[PDB]
């Protein structure tokens, strides 16, 4: 069909070209025969027939009369559907301004003619006249004159001096000027005088008019001469129940427009005075503006309805306009939903589907199959058969359902695993049965949550569901390689109770041939589930060529682990089932199974795991009772000591000895200490409570108490909840946030009184509100993140860039918080690989660092690894497959075509739910491991005592062990004491150095991503060299820079009334701390560079997320950052046609000036620009996406005045237009077309 879409200003001729007739009446229907009154808003002559292929009069009534024009009613006979397509027009008596170009924030009409907005509005209201085409007179072609000036003005020159008032004047201003003339002069003006204002108005206006003229749209078209009307069936008057009618308020607005225009024409024909006709012109302007966009004016009230009326821009823009509610998202046929249930008997790749839902859903396929097999004469008979629900059709539904997958989705869709494909299993009832292992991926509780189902109709959809969206194909999370099918609660418990050892049970220490003997022993009740035993077991090892070998041995284990070994697939070692099998390890089991044996076994392994977990958790008989909760008798003794201390401190504070705040803080500290004491007492009482006897008097073990097992296994709970079921429960705060002066001394095992519950209610309300509102804020963040970076795909495999980033184990000034193996795994190297002394090249520049190579680097232990990144990619308008990496649910490299930016945004979005909108309340270096001191970037001096003291602020301290790696890094302040220096060796825990040391949880990410600066920013010097101070005290005390080999014309104006940190007689590098406080990322890029700012952003967001314990790979934030910096401002035009201060996207100027650099002509210099996500989202060429997102009005007006053409590359706009995505399967197809 068609290609790229164009948008521009509408010529009145073009408006009439769309239009077939002019509406001349405000009437809609005849009021008795609801036929349309010709010719009005609803008209058959202008628009079309009310009924299919019928004249309004009925003379040419037959259906054979196609294309004939009637002559008694002037109606053309066609389908009534064309009553929704055909347009009309209205000829305005007086010219009218288009409010979209008037009230756009950069007013198009106002900025075009170099005129302020207030003056234009004062002119449109007939408050003041305005000159046009004065020739040789006193005033220029544009000026403002009051009525008492216009009085004696025309008396000076009756001719050669034209001066009108109103919209006709603005149209004469737009038509009189031809922009070539006013551009040629702006050239010289902007050439000579510097005057930042001059260049700003220049760049804006000159770009406006040059891109303006390039298209061909004329300025006069900002003034509306003709007005196009919407087809009637788009704003219908369809009758409703009870004789009442329903209509869009558009009809009322068009009605007012027609009425007032006709009244203005009548007043013109009646020779009305100037006051009345000016009032009518203003009123007509008001009506037209209310029609176009209601809200920038008096906000016309409805008729008998107090709310305003929905205008056209109101139909388009907003979260409920045709963009958010229709084009991006739409209601779908062949779909349903219901409450969900468990269905544990299911294998992983299926779900329980009710009979009635599957019947109503697959109706067309049922009809087709029934009439294909001859069981139904025709399609009507098939519908009658299913409406009767005959017994034969159930087998036909069996046939059509077998190999036809269905799609399941939950309401809070965060990541792609929010939708998954399953195989239908017909189930009696009305509830959907969802496999339990997938619930973790869905975040779907069984607390009433409902899920929806969809049916893939076409063959391509079925194959995409089976090969991509299948539950079996998606086991590893995309955000991190961790599995998403991990057993959740009951199965984890079952396996924990199975695999475990008590000190004594039936048949401890006996011997068995293998696991089958263990099953025979247990099921007959002769041997206990947990008992220390030795059994012969056969484990398998792929060995020495890939050929499978097997070895048997006598292993020390328990009966439960022996029985469990039967499920373990061939290749795994027995060591994996010899531990206690916590949830954390029940995950690593499946992880290793997938890494070794592949997907095919791992699936059946997980199925059998869930089966046996549920079975043995049932068999165990686990429960929870009132006595299962421990209550240490020491509890009251600790309470008593605490309250004796509080009466002591009340004695001391009463007799004016300890101050108020100090005593309060001390009470807080002692209460926290007492809470910790009670917690430790109850935990030691409960954890190893079990005192038992085995061939001897007494021994003790890990307790078999129910709630303790539920806590330790990871099935349900953590330390805090168990602490609160048993011991005194912490301390809360008042609405101010001030912590209470008397912590709760009760547990839920006991009975709380009124005060304690009333105080806990505060925190309960705070936290529940945080959840309820933070979830919506997080969804908002997810939307911004998808919009900024979604148009990114794997366009080409490689680009050839050698740029990359250095990777080291992250250390924040303490111990390592994340190893280098987590940060480098799954990424392609960016350089040659050598040992510290260049022994030989271990790894090349393009080997994907998979597990083998990660381990090999672990052997050599070099920890400065240059790796390829997404931001450094040379690819234009896309990403190369090598620089991305390999990460996916699948373990191989990324495929040529997968849409990675959307996955990145979803990966960041899923942890957004786990965050919190409002936070809960809130001497020297001590080395942890043994190593060697390495002082880096430090000036040192030997003091009187001989201890090395530090005279620099940027001092860093590394711990180099005997291999050469760096595990400990710290930042040492200026003026510290070092008993050591650079070169010696220290012990573990040895104090190396000493010195005297002297509010939003989740939006801490949003403010960071938006590139928003801190409230009080720090400053960074511009260039390296020695610094000093200068001119005195007027708002700013100047900072003089000093470079080494040249002078510094640079001189910064830093306000003196803020404390500085830079040493007035010391050297400072470009980007060194001249003061303190948080910093703004744009300046961080502007000084340090690209890699520094992307490293800052990824590290900061990784800290914020890691605090809540969510694993996220750096790649997604890498691609977000690459899309953030996409824009850059030109600096020197050179031999290019760019503007000196123009902001263009990096890739475009890149390819252009790179071709000019391959040419002989000099290139153009640029400077990278940092745009926030909600701002870089606007810097998207194809405006359709920009209007789907950010405010639609101004976006359309800008792209329209520019005459911007749109070839619809990328995804979102293809989604709008409704054809194939250029990312997934379609990419191949699209790769066939874009090359064509």
């Amino acid at each position: 069909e068609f290609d790229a879409i164009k948008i521009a200003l509408a010529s009145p001729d073009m408006i009439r070209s769309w239009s077939f007739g002019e509406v001349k009446k405000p009437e809609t229907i005849n009021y008795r025969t609801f036929k349309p009154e010709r010719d009005g808003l609803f008209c058959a002559r202008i628009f079309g027939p009310v009924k299919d292929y019928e004249c309004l009069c009925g003379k040419y009534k037959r259906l054979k009369h196609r294309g004939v024009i009637c002559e008694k009613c002037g109606v053309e006979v066609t389908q009534t559907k064309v009553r929704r397509e055909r347009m009309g027009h209205i000829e305005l008596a007086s010219p009218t301004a288009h409010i979209w170009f008037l009230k756009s924030l950069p007013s198009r009409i106002g900025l075009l003619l170099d005129m302020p907005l207030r003056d234009i509005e004062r002119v449109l209201y007939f408050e003041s006249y305005v000159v046009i085409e004065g020739g040789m007179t006193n005033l220029e072609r544009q000026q403002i004159l009051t009525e008492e000036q216009y009085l004696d003005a025309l008396e000076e020159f009756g001719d050669e001096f034209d001066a009108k008032m109103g919209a006709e004047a603005i149209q004469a201003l737009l038509k009189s000027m031809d922009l070539e003339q006013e551009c040629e002069q702006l050239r010289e003006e902007l050439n000579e005088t510097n005057s930042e204002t001059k260049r700003k108005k220049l760049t804006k206006r000159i770009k406006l008019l040059e891109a303006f003229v390039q298209s061909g749209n004329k300025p006069e078209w900002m003034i509306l001469t003709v007005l196009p009307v919407l087809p009637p069936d788009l704003r219908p008057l369809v009758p409703l129940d009870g004789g009442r009618f329903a209509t869009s308020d558009l009809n009322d607005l068009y009605r007012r427009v027609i009425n007032r225009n006709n009244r203005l024409k009548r007043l013109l024909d009646l020779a009305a005075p100037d006051i009345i006709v000016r009032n009518e012109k203003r009123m007509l302007q008001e009506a037209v503006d209310a029609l176009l966009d209601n809200g920038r004016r008096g906000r016309a009230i409805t008729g008998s309805n107090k709310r305003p009326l929905k205008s056209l821009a109101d139909m388009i823009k907003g979260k409920q306009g045709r963009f958010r509610q229709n084009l991006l998202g739409k209601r779908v046929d062949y779909s349903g939903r219901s409450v969900i249930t468990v269905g544990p008997y299911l294998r992983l790749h299926q779900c329980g589907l009710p009979k009635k839902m599957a019947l109503e859903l697959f109706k067309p396929f049922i009809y087709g199959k029934l009439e294909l097999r001859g069981l139904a004469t025709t399609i009507k008979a098939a519908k009658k058969m299913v409406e009767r629900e005959e017994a034969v059709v159930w087998d036909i539904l069996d046939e059509v359902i077998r190999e036809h997958p269905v799609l399941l989705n939950r309401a809070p869709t965060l990541h792609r695993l929010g939708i998954q494909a399953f195989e239908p299993v017909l189930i009696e009832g009305k509830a959907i049965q969802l496999h339990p292992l997938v619930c973790a991926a869905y975040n779907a509780d069984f607390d009433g949550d409902q899920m929806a189902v969809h049916v893939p109709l076409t063959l391509e959809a079925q194959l995409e569901a089976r090969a991509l969206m299948m539950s079996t194909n998606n086991i590893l999370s995309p955000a991190n390689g961790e599995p998403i099918i991990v057993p959740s609660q009951d199965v984890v418990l079952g396996l924990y109770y199975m695999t475990r050892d008590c000190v004594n049970a039936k048949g401890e220490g006996m011997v068995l041939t293998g696991p089958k003997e263990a099953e025979r022993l247990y099921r007959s009740g002769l041997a206990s589930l947990h008992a220390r035993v030795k059994v012969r077991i056969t484990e398998y090892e792929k060995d020495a060529n890939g050929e499978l070998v097997a070895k048997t041995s006598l292993k020390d284990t328990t009966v439960g682990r022996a029985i469990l070994w039967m499920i373990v697939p061939k290749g795994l070692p027995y060591s994996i089932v010899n531990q206690a099998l916590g949830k954390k390890a029940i995950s690593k089991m499946l992880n290793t199974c997938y890494r070794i044996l592949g997907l095919k076994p791992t699936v059946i392994f997980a199925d059998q795991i869930m089966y046996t977990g549920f079975a043995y958790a049932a068999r165990s008989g686990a429960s929870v009772g009132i006595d299962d909760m421990v209550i240490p008798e020491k509890k009251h003794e600790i309470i008593s000591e605490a309250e004796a201390e509080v009466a002591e401190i009340q004695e001391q504070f009463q007799s004016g000895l300890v101050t108020a705040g100090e005593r309060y803080n001390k009470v807080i500290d002692i209460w926290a200490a007492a809470n910790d004491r009670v917690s430790k007492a109850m935990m030691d009482n409960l954890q190893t409570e079990t005192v038992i006897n085995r061939d001897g008097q007494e021994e003790k073990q890990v307790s078999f108490n129910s709630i303790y097992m539920m806590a330790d296994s990871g099935a349900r709970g953590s330390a805090a909840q168990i602490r609160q079921l048993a011991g005194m429960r912490g301390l809360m705060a008042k609405p101010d946030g001030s912590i209470i002066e008397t912590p709760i001394t009760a547990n839920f095992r006991e009975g709380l009184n009124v005060l304690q519950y009333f105080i806990s209610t505060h925190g309960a309300r705070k936290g529940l509100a945080d959840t309820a509102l933070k979830t919506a804020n997080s969804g908002y963040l997810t939307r911004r993140l998808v919009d900024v970076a979604q148009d990114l795909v794997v366009t080409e495999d490689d680009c050839g860039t050698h740029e990359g980033i250095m990777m080291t184990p992250v250390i924040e000034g303490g111990d390592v918080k994340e190893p280098l193996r987590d940060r480098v795994l799954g990424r392609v190297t960016a350089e040659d690989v050598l040992k510290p002394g260049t022994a030989d090249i271990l790894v090349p520049r393009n080997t994907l660092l998979h597990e083998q190579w990660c381990d090999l680097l672990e052997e050599n232990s070099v920890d400065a690894v240059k790796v390829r990144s997404v931001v450094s990619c040379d690819t234009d308008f896309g990403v190369c497959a090598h620089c991305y990496g390999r990460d996916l649910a699948r373990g191989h490299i990324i495929n040529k075509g997968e849409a990675i930016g959307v996955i990145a945004a979803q990966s960041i979005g899923e942890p957004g739910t786990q965050l919190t909108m409002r936070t809960f309340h809130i001497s020297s270096i001590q080395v942890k491991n043994k190593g060697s001191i390495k002082l880096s970037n430090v000036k040192s001096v030997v003091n009187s005592s001989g201890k090395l003291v530090i005279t620099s602020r940027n001092t860093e301290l590394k711990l180099i062990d005997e291999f050469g790696r760096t595990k400990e890094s710290y930042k040492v302040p200026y003026g510290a004491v070092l008993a050591k220096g650079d070169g010696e060796q220290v012990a573990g825990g040895e104090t190396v150095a000493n010195w005297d040391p002297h509010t939003g949880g989740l939006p801490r990410v949003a403010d960071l991503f938006e590139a928003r600066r801190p409230k009080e920013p720090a400053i960074l010097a511009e260039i390296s060299g020695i610094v000093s101070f200068g001119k005195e005290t007027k708002g700013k005390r100047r900072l003089v820079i000093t470079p080494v080999d040249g002078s510094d014309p640079y001189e910064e104006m830093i306000p003196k009334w803020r404390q500085l940190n830079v040493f007035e007689g010391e050297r400072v590098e470009r980007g060194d701390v001249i003061s303190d406080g948080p910093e703004a990322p744009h300046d961080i890029l502007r000084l340090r560079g690209v890699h520094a700012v992307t490293r800052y952003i990824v590290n900061e967001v990784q800290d914020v997320y890691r605090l809540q314990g969510v694993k996220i790979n750096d790649k997604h934030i890498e691609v977000i950052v690459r899309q953030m910096l996409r824009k850059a401002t030109i600096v020197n035009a050179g031999s290019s046609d760019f503007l000196e201060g123009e902001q263009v996207e990096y890739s475009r100027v890149k390819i252009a000036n790179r071709e000019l650099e391959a040419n002989g002509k000099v290139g153009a210099t640029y400077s990278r620009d940092l745009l926030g996500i909600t701002k870089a989202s606007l810097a998207t060429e194809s405006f359709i996406s920009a209007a789907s997102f950010q405010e639609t009005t101004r976006v359309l007006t800008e792209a329209a005045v520019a005459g911007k053409r749109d070839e619809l590359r990328g995804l979102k706009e293809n989604v709008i237009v409704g054809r194939l995505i250029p990312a997934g399967t379609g990419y191949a197809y699209h790769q066939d077309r874009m090359r064509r």
């Binding site: 349900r716 809360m732 936290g767």
Partner: peptide, 21 residues
């Protein structure tokens, strides 16, 4: 405590924060 569906208002300062069911 854990299994994040509602936050734990009651804790010693510095703990990450639950995120409790």
């Amino acid at each position: 405590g854990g299994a994040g569906h509602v936050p734990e208002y009651f804790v010693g300062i510095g703990t990450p924060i639950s995120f409790y069911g």
